[PDB]
């Protein structure tokens, strides 16, 4: 593994937003995959409309 | 529909086998985050273990061997095994389902006390 | 690791007056500390979240704010529903340490 601090790249003045990662998913991550699936997962009794 | 209840908790003795249960319904313990928490008397609260989705086991620095945990989801239950009590652990514990960093502990129930009195 | 040294623990005032509850980080928490309310021997009620957002159901007289180091809790309006035990928590850096909160009563 090579890290290195990205402050010169990828470093705004403004606030860089722009890293999201995802809460709701199924499947475990089987080997090599690469889902780009938008399910909703209903967690409860209210259903998420 | 959906519900968490809690089952076991009593005055077992230091080092001294118990059973703390969670049953879930409406969601799923193996495919998703989900936690337990101790809250000592005249003390903050404290986090206890995590099961996440992907058969990854992470723990507190107190709890790294102490507890055992086994989910299922055939009723949605966690159990937690706690053998090599210590006196320490009487404390009033809750088992919650945490869903990230978007405020911590937003839904709560009622908790169980565990005390590990002689 | 992430570990609050809130000054206050219990402070004590008389009926009316303003409630400023400080929590200082000794990193920096980015906009991810949260206010609750717990009662006197009740569980803890989540209030404010995220730093800056408001919760449905939270009365107008709780107040939230920081993005850093500082960390502020207001209340103008007191109530004898508002004593309780205010916990300042960081979910930011693992592992996720809960904090000591100031207890206000009155």
């Known amino acids: 593994v090579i890290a290195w601090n990205s402050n010169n790249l990828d470093s705004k003045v403004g606030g860089n937003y722009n890293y999201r990662y995802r809460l709701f998913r199924k499947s475990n991550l089987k080997p090599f995959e690469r889902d780009i699936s938008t399910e909703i997962y209903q967690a409860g009794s209210k259903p998420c409309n | 529909e959906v519900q968490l209840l809690e089952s076991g908790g009593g005055l077992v003795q230091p080092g001294g086998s118990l059973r703390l249960s969670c049953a879930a319904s409406g969601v799923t313990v193996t495919s998703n985050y989900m936690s337990w928490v101790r809250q000592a008397p005249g003390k903050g609260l404290e986090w206890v273990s995590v099961?996440?989705?992907?058969?990854?086991?992470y723990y507190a620095d107190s709890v790294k061997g102490r507890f055992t945990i086994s989910r299922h989801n055939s009723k949605n239950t966690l159990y937690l095994q706690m053998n090599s009590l210590r006196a320490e652990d009487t404390a009033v514990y809750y088992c919650a389902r945490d869903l990230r960093e978007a405020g911590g502990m937003d839904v709560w129930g009622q908790g169980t006390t565990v005390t590990v009195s002689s | 690791d992430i570990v609050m040294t809130q000054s206050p623990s219990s402070l004590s005032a008389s009926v009316g007056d303003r409630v400023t509850i400080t929590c200082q980080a000794s990193?920096?928490?980015?906009?991810?500390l949260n206010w609750y309310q717990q009662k006197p021997g009740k569980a803890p009620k989540l209030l404010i979240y995220?730093?800056?957002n408001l919760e449905t159901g939270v009365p107008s007289r709780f107040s939230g704010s920081g993005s850093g180091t500082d960390f502020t809790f207001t209340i103008s309006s007191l109530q004898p529903e508002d004593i309780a035990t205010y916990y300042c928590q960081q979910f930011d850096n693992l592992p996720w340490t809960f904090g000591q909160g100031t207890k206000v009563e009155i």
């Open positions: 099961i996440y989705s992907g058969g990854s086991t």
């Open positions: 995220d730093a800056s």
């Open positions: 990193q920096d928490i980015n906009n991810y």
